[PDB]
Amino acid sequence: KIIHLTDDSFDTDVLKADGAILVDFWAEWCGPCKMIAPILDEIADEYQGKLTVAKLNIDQNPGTAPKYGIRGIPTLLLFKNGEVAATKVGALSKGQLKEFLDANL
Amino acid sequence: MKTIKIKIKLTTDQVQLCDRYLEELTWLWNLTLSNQLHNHCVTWYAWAAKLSADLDKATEKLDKLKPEQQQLVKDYYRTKDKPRLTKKEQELVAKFDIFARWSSFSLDGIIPVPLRLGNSGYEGLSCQIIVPHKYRTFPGGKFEGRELTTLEKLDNVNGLNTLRAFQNLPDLQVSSHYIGGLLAFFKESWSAFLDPKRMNSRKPKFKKDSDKITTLSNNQCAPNRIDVNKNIVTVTGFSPITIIDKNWVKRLNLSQVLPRTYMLTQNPSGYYINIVIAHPLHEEKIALVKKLPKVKKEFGEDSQEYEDIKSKIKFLEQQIKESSIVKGKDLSVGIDPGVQAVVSTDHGALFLPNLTRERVSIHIEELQSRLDNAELINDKKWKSLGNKTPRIKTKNETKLQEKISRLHERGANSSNAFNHKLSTRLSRTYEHIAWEDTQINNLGLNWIMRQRCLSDLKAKTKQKTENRGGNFHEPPANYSSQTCHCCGQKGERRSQHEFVCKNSDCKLFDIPQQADTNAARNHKQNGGF
RNA sequence: ACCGCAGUUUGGGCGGGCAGCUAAUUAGCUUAUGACUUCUAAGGCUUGCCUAAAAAGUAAGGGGGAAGGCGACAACCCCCAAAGACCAGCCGGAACUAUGGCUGGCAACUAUAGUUGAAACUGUCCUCUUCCUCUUUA
C-alpha cells in the first residue's frame, strides 16, 4: 500500500501532493531499517485515510537524501505541502512511532 | 566500608605532576569511549538476532492457538483502543507481549557495519550513509596486532604508549593503578547505560578542556606508607606528601581497621587523600570470593569445594555483620517530613532545618550577578577597542569565580554534615523507624526544598538503622495528612499547620493539634506500631 | 551581616569589619550577604571639588626592630601565646536550641573549696533533572 518513490518525481509527489506524507529513507543492508519495515507497513494500513506513507531507497534515489538534511538511515520525514512538518531519526519502536504520529497529526 | 578524608599539602612540582596525570587520564577516557562506541555494534546485532527469534516464537505460539481469540488478541496491540478482556485472552496477550514493541524481520543478508547510538543502547540506532565492522589494534610494541575487544584490553601501558606515539604525543608518565581506576569508572558508567532497569542513565559523554578529570583513583592497593608519628603518606607516583590534618590519626584508627584503596582529590578547599577502610576480616572474604571462579571452573558448582567456599563466605559475612550490632530499648518512631520543620516526630518533636545554607545560597546569587555585570563590561570594552579574537579572562574575574565555587562547596558540606548528625541521632534513639513523605505540595518552594536534601537524610538514616540491627519501614502515603489518627475520619484544618478531627465520637474532638504530629502518628500506625 | 585561619560543618575562638545615634581617638545601641590602596570610563554641585562601575593590588594571633612599596603595607630578625576545646563509663522519646544530665580521672582559671573544658563525620564516579545569573523576544 505504501508508495515507492523516485528522485525524478519527488517534488510533485511529496510537496504538491495534498495531505501529510510520511517518507521513510530506506536501505537494504541495514539492521535497524529491517527492524522497522514491518512497523511502517502496519502504520500505512492502520492510519489509512488519515496519513499517507511513502518510501525512498537511498541506493536508488541518492540525491534526495542529502537535500533534506539527512545523514543516517533510517529517517522519517512527515512532509506537509512543500516543507518537512516533522523529522525523526532512529529505529523507533511501535509505541514510540505511534505516539510520535499522534502528537504530530 | 567507610572513607576517611584527610587534607594534604602539595609542592609546586607535585601539583604540576598531578595536572599532567589528569590530562593523560582525560585522554584515556576519550580513547576508551571512542573504542566502546565503535564496538557496540556486535552487541546490538546479537540482541537483534535473539529478539527476532523471540518474535518468531511468539508468532508461532499465537498462530497455533484457536482462531477465535487470536484475532482480538492481535487487534489489542494493533489498535490503540484496548477493551477489558477476559482472563483467557489476557493470558495470551501477556504471553505474546513482544508484539507490543516489534514485529518479525529476516535480519539476513546484512553487512554488520558500525552503528551510531542515540539516547538508548538498543532502539534508535542508525548507520551513517558497506565496510564490515573490524577491530582496532595497538599499532606496535610487544603487543602488536591485539584486537581491543573490551575496555579491559586498554589496561596496557605498552599499547597506550604505542598509540600516543602514533598520535605524536609523549609517552605516559601516569602509573597503571590510576589507569585501572579510570577504566573502572568507565565500566560502571557503561554498565549503567546498558541496564534497562535504569531509565535515567544514558551514554557517557566526551570530556572537553573545561571538564577534565579532577581525581586520581587507586583501586588496587592501599598507600605504600602511612607514617603516623611524622605525618607523611607515601603513595604511588609522587614523592612523600605532608598531612595538615590534626585528627586524622584518631579518625583513621589504623590499629583496628584495614586500608583497601585510596583517591587523591582536589576541591576548592584544597587537596585531599581519601582512604577506604573496612573490617579486618574483609581481606579473607575477598580472597575466597575471587577464588570462586577457579573452583567453579575446576570442580563445578555441584562439588563439595564450592559448598565449602560458600559456607565460609557466609560465616565471615555474618561475623562482619554482627561486628557492628547494638542492643536497643525497642522504641518506635513515626517520621514525617515537613515544610517548616525538616522532620516531625510522632510525639511532637519538630526539627529545624539547616537555615544557615539559605544565606549561602543568597550570597551566591549576589556574587553571580556581580560577576556577570563585570564580564559584560569587559566584553564591551574588548569589542570597542577593535578586536575580534576571543577574550582572555581577567584576574578579578578569576577571584570572583573562586569565591563562588568555594561558597557552593561550603553549602554542600554544610548540608552533608547536618544530615549526618540528624541521621546518627535518630539511629541512636530509635530502633524501628517508619518514614513517609507527601511531596504533593510540589504540584520558591523548590528553591527551599532543594537545600534540605531529604533523600540523602533518608538514605543515611536507613543505612545507619540497618547497620545497628534496627528496622526501617516505608508505609504507603494514602490519606495520611487529612485523616484523624485516633478515628480515621477526615478532619479539617483551622490554620496553616493546625488540624481538628470532625466526628463527635472522637476523643480529640474540637481540640486543635499540630498537623505534622498527626501525620507522624498516622505513619507509625500504618507501620504496625 | 559578611570575610580570613584553624581536617569539614554547626555553637563558639583569634583577627578584618561600611554608615548613623549616644557618651567619653575610644567605649556602648541601631545596622551593611566583607574591609582598604592606586589609576580611570562615567555622574553631581559649581573652573575647582566630591562619588565612583571596570582594571591592578594589600592585610586578616599580640609586641619591638627593619631592606623595600606611589599606597594599603612589608621580605628578614627577637620575645609572648596556642579552641572548630580532654579521656572512660552510665542514664536519656535526645525537640524547642546543630546533643541534655551523673560519676571518676586530667588540665586551665579563680577564691582546701568553686568555674570551664559542646556535638558529628562514607566519600567518589556517572547519567538525568533542577536552581541561579545574565541576555534576546513577548
Next chain:
DNA sequence: TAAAGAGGAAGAGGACATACAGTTGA
C-alpha cells in the same frame, strides 16, 4: 511577568571500594 540560550553549580539515585604471576632496578 513569560519563554528560549549559554554557563556555573548542585540534588537523585545506583554502584563501588582486586587477586595472583612476571619483571625491574637500586
Next chain:
DNA sequence: TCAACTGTATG
C-alpha cells in the same frame, strides 16, 4: 634480592 610496578583473569 626484595619492594614496587606491570601484565592477566573475572566479574
